[PDB]
Design a protein around this nucleic acid. Structure first.
Lengths: 92, 84, 99, 104, 105, 93, 78, 96
DNA sequence: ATCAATATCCACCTGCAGATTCTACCAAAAGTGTATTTGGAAACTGCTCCATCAAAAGGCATGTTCAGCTGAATTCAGCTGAACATGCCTTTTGATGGAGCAGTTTCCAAATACACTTTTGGTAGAATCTGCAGGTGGATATTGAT
DNA sequence: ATCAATATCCACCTGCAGATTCTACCAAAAGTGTATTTGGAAACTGCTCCATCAAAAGGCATGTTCAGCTGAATTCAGCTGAACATGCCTTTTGATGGAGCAGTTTCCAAATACACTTTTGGTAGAATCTGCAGGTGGATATTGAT
């Protein structure tokens, strides 16, 4: 028991900087980061669906939540990455 | 319809003076008026931007008072009186 | 005389008057145009419920008034009585609106 | 054959889905939502690790520490805005002295 | 057939509140005491602001409470002011308040 | 097309505290926003509280602690009393 | 105890804040501010402690307290 | 040899804005913490990381606050921060 | 600006220890395969509400004068707050134990979620009522000039 | 210390736009009869958490000196407030077309519910390593002084 995002953060770390490592304290920081952004996106998506009297959160709510939450350029790319993963997911 | 331009200047010197009065201001420097317009515009873009985002998400063409109320809540400017 | 109130007297008279009332201080139609312009040079073909426009005016006037109170405190603090762009900037920076 | 690999992500789509279902956000959760949300979380993570990595490199370090994550966040206009009400423990602050306080 | 409100000695709707709790996605299960306790707190708070607003209306010689009265009651009450510190009341205006340094010397 | 409100209940409480006083629709609009707002804050906090304690159900105990977290001093003390009193009275059949 | 938060340590904080010159009355003003800050956060943290029926204040209790006060902290369990 | 007033002050700002170590002594801080906690619930225990989160939060808060105080002092044509500067910053911040 | 004399910084190396990273394994999620449920999209269409226009009316925004008095400069010295050498004690920190206690287990009785079936409490308008917005006038200051 | 010039009150008045009630349904509580959990309540651990001890060491509390920063006191150029003449364009009222919310149905592609089969991620030891913390030695940055 007691799951965390460490493994995944690390894999991503090796993709962008194979040569670089990360300390425990820094890893704790990244974990807080992921949990925080996760709660903000889900929280907003939660409100969006309720405002529109829908009972299910689809990628569409996640997308608008992202546009509302991330500033300009971060939103564009996040949105790009997002629709890209749903496409590659559906196909095969 | 008809091109909308320079409407920010619709926020007049006397209307800004009044707002400053309600805010307790006695004396106003000549450059305050353009600063205030700049600040209002930023305030309005951010709220209108979110309000319209809630509108498009509902697939509507009409921005509702609720769209604005939710945008205000997000921006940390909760508004009472239009929750219908 | 011709009679003439000293500079500052009328300003104080105006503060008392506007802190006494609650009506919107910016003209209606002009403000609605501003909303429509910003909204449009943002997303075309938008319509607005009249109350939606009023929600924005009420909100933007409470914001400016609150901002001016903070601005006034920044001027008084600099040992002035006249608000300047410099005061609004200091207030916005401390309010974390711009930093 | 995991949903992550299918979506081509390093982040766990399955867990994000479970976290969404059990987080009391809505009665139901679409299949794409966890994928989409997982992609967004991975991207921002890569973004920060990218910049913090450089912060380490510019410090003659190979190991990313809190200080680096802080230098990456604060020196980036957007990440800074997004994390404006957040404090990175052990991150310190950006060196910065108001002009008026300088000598001569 | 007793309403849960009367069983609870309340004016506010216990049934409505309970329904709102279950449909708001707050938790998977909602205890029977939750809506009763929440309806009571909500009722107490609206009784607190109406008491003060009614008095503001009286001080202004009106018999009908309007938004300004609500504002005067809230901003003049330390705890309510704290609780609604980030809230804005449409048509409420502000408190009469002029910094001393600005008065005729 | 029917929309619920708290007007009926806000109006009853008003007569209780000020029998002689009325309330304009705009003032009632403000009161409705207020009730809805505090409701969400209490529910919101109760929701979190339960989640942090791996509990799947929100009970008067969650509402109570949410109330103490949200309201300042006296307001909290009194809301808690009314809340408890209403619950005990409710369970007393 | 609050007097335990010493002048020199308050000077250090100020320095990291970029402050060059400090008035003699700042030290006591700072302590009053630190105390109000700690009372607010701890009170909330301890409320999460009592709620979980524990005798031990946990980092998570603190982290949640800080989040409520609009002071989100990263690195201690969220 | 004696450095002129302000010179060592500037030097410290550079040193401290460069580091990340907690600036308040630990024991004293832990002591202040337990005392205040004692007023809300008696005989409490504290995870060591609970105490560290509080110190981290407190110091970042005080540092941020000194930044706004400094801006308020500079605004009044000063270089010395005073209680009126801290007071103004907290007022604008909405903490008062 | 240099001359010279303090202290400050800053490289380049360098040796270990505290953490990292690397391994070797088991439950609890995650992925499947079926079998049902269903939310909410597509297809109308009833009908609020919004965008527009017409038009008259006077509340207010514009500009211009004029000069009161406020903000910006200067000057100056009293005294607060920086830099320091001193002397000392409260903070560090490192085990060492003992123990108060978060975390788990194992029940299960009390409390909830469910599926219907009646029963009203509320909401949506018509039918009645009425504070009070807007006007008018002297009583009362408040100001600002002699 | 007076007064004109004006602005500010306060009370008295009265029809009407904006509440209050009065009436009717009906979406949604309330009452019942089962089928699940939920989350305490005892009993026990392995932890992290206080408690001491106990030295040593910075790191803090002091008392001196004096540099130079904060304010107080003076000036004054010219910005910004108060007033006035003009007449523009926001306000008010009403009338319409019809854009596009919203309400209803109709019902599949998609989500939920299990019952199982596999697999991945969190643990608790094992095999290196990135940097800290010192150590010189060499230019720097300050600050006093020709």
């Amino acid at each position: 028991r007691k799951e965390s995002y460490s493994i995944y953060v690390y894999k991503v770390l090796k993709q962008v900087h194979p040569d670089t490592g990360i300390s425990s304290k820094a890893m704790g920081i990244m974990n807080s980061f992921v949990n925080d952004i996760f709660e903000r996106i889900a929280g907003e998506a939660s409100r969006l669906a309720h405002y529109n009297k829908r009972s299910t959160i689809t990628s569409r709510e996640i997308q608008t939540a992202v546009r509302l939450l991330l500033p300009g350029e971060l939103a564009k790319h996040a949105v790009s990455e997002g629709t890209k993963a749903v496409t590659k997911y559906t196909s095969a | 319809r008809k091109v909308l331009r320079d409407n920010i200047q619709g926020i007049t010197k006397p209307a800004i003076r009044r707002l400053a009065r309600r805010g307790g201001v006695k004396r106003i420097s000549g450059l305050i008026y353009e600063e205030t317009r700049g600040v209002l515009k930023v305030f309005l873009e951010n709220v209108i931007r979110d309000a319209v985002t809630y509108t498009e998400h509902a697939k509507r063409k009409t921005v509702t008072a609720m769209d604005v109320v939710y945008a205000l809540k997000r921006q940390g400017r909760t508004l009472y009186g239009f929750g219908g | 005389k011709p009679h003439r109130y000293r500079p500052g007297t009328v300003a104080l008279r105006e503060i008392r008057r506007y802190q006494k009332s609650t009506e919107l201080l910016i003209r209606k139609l002009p403000f609605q145009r501003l909303v429509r312009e910003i909204a449009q040079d943002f997303k075309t073909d938008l319509r607005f419920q009249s109350s939606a426009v009023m929600a924005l005016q009420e909100a933007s006037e409470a914001y400016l008034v609150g901002l001016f109170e903070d601005t006034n405190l920044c001027a008084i603090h600099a040992k002035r009585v006249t608000i300047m762009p410099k005061d609004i900037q200091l207030a916005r920076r401390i309010r974390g609106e711009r930093a | 054959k995991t949903r992550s690999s299918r979506a081509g992500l390093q982040f766990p789509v399955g867990r994000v889905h479970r976290l969404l279902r059990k987080g009391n956000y809505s009665e139901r959760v679409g299949a794409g939502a966890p994928v989409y949300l997982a992609a967004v979380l991975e991207y921002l993570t890569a973004e920060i690790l990218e910049l913090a990595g450089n912060a380490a490199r510019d410090n003659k370090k190979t190991r990313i520490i809190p200080r680096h994550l802080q230098l990456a966040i604060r020196n980036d206009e957007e990440l800074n805005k997004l994390l404006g009400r957040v404090t990175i423990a052990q991150g310190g602050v950006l060196p910065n002295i108001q002009a008026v306080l300088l000598p001569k």
